[PDB]
Amino acid sequence: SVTCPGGQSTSNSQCCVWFDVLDDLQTNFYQGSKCESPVRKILRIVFHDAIGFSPALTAAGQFGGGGADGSIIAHSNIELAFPANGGLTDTIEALRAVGINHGVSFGDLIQFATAVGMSNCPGSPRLEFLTGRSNSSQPSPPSLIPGPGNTVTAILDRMGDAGFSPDEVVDLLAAHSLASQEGLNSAIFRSPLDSTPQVFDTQFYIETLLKGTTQPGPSLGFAEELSPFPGEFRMRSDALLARDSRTACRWQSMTSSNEVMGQRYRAAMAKMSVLGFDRNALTDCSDVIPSAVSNNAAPVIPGGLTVDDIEVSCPSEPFPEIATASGPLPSLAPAP
Ligand code: HEM
Ligand SMILES: *[C@@H]1O[C@H](CO)[C@@H](O[C@@H]2O[C@H](CO)[C@@H](O)[C@H](O)[C@H]2NC(C)=O)[C@H](O)[C@H]1NC(C)=O
Numbered sequence: 587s588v589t590c591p592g593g594q595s596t597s598n599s600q601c602c603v604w605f606d607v608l609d610d611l612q613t614n615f616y617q618g619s620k621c622e623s624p625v626r627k628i629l630r631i632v633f634h635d636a637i638g639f640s641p642a643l644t645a646a647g648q649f650g651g652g653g654a655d656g657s658i659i660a661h662s663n664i665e666l667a668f669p670a671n672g673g674l675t676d677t678i679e680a681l682r683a684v685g686i687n688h689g690v691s692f693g694d695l696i697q698f699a700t701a702v703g704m705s706n707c708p709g710s711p712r713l714e715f716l717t718g719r720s721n722s723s724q725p726s727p728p729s730l731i732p733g734p735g736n737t738v739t740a741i742l743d744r745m746g747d748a749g750f751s752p753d754e755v756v757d758l759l760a761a762h763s764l765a766s767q768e769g770l771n772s773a774i775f776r777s778p779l780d781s782t783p784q785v786f787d788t789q790f791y792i793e794t795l796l797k798g799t800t801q802p803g804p805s806l807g808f809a810e811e812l813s814p815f816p817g818e819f820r821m822r823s824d825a826l827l828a829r830d831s832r833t834a835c836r837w838q839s840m841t842s843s844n845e846v847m848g849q850r851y852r853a854a855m856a857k858m859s860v861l862g863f864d865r866n867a868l869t870d871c872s873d874v875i876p877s878a879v880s881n882n883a884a885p886v887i888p889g890g891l892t893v894d895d896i897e898v899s900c901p902s903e904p905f906p907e908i909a910t911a912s913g914p915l916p917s918l919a920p921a922p
């Protein structure tokens with residue numbers, strides 16, 4: 587049955603080249619299978635590539651975008667001029683070379699590089715991986731990427747038009763658990779968005795809900811809000827979404843269980859990976875993706891803060907009783 591040249595077993599002969607690009611990415615792009623800045627940049631790239639898709643434009647005669655077609659790489663020259671795509675150039679070039687070297691389509695390569703990057707981060711689910719997207723793309727229309735200064739209504743309209751309900755917008759945001767910013771406030775380069783930028787866990791949902799207390803750098807940056815402690819950056823769209831009535835209750839159910847957040851994230855990401863394609867036209871190669879080490883820490887309210895410091899926004903569900911740490915307030919180092 588399907589034994590790939592190097593003896594691994596797989597569902598289908600189209601999955602065998604993906605064991606080679608797996609080794610190239612882990613050794614080179616991920617520097618020895620690490621969960622550091624390349625993983626974070628790839629997670630931003632899969633969303634900015636997949637979200638250039640608009641049924642609204644199609645419906646009014648315009649090209650609405652091919653979705654998760656690898657257009658951000660193939661037409662990087664037009665797409666990396668978009669406001670939202672700053673700081674992605676060096677990662678787009680690294681990906682272009684791996685894709686030209688193994689003969690895989692750019693849309694498939696981005697989805698693959700996302701599932702492999704997440705396997706290096708403790709706590710991550712095994713994301714579905716499908717191969718078969720055509721390498722031909724057209725440039726994404728501008729203005730389809732949500733910005734950090736947008737209102738929650740604007741973000742829900744855009745995501746909604748792409749096909750996501752408010753609940754799936756909160757689920758998709760589990761990726762800000764492995765995250766930092768470099769261009770919203772350059773004085774505090776790589777400031778994490780939660781206290782564990784290398785662990786895919788619930789902390790992001792807990793910490794954006796705490797009262798904004800600290801200005802982390804010398805001045806405020808683009809769409810920056812006050813954060814709960816030294817070194818953490820809080821962006822305006824994440825603060826608004828945690829608190830708005832349309833999304834506040836789903837953001838609250840995401841704080842207590844890494845298992846529920848993970849399943850929810852995996853399901854939204856699987857949907858987002860096929861925007862612009864018919865998943866029944868693709869071949870399933872999920873089994874090429876390895877397991878992530880498990881995360882054994884339980885959700886906590888960091889540094890001595892208590893439930894009295896989180897701004898409860900869901901008016902029907904009471905807050906989960908989460909553990910507290912007997913700590914002095916943390917100060918976060920920049921994410922690696
Ligand atoms: C509600 C929409 C969202 C907005 C407005 C948004 C906005 C941003 C912004 C402005 C940054 C900081 C970029 C920088 O200056 O370096 C950021 C970082 C990041 N975002 Fe989002 N984001 C959203 C949704 C998502 C989604 C759905 C994913 C992916 C599944 C994602 C993954 C990331 C990651 C991993 C980073 C960290 C990158 C790094 O550390 O270099 N974001 N996001
Ligand atoms: C996918 O399409 C892109 C073109 O859009 C191809 O990329 C080019 O590949 C050649 C050599 O094959 C390079 O010299 C070019 O610089 C690449 N162009 C871009 C824009 O990156 C790529 O080869 C295609 N891949 C496959 C397997 O069809």
Ligand SMILES: [Ca+2]
Pocket residue numbers: 634635636637638652653654655656657658726
């Ligand atoms: Ca695209």
Ligand SMILES: [Ca+2]
Pocket residue numbers: 762763764780781782783784785786787788789790
């Ligand atoms: Ca985290």
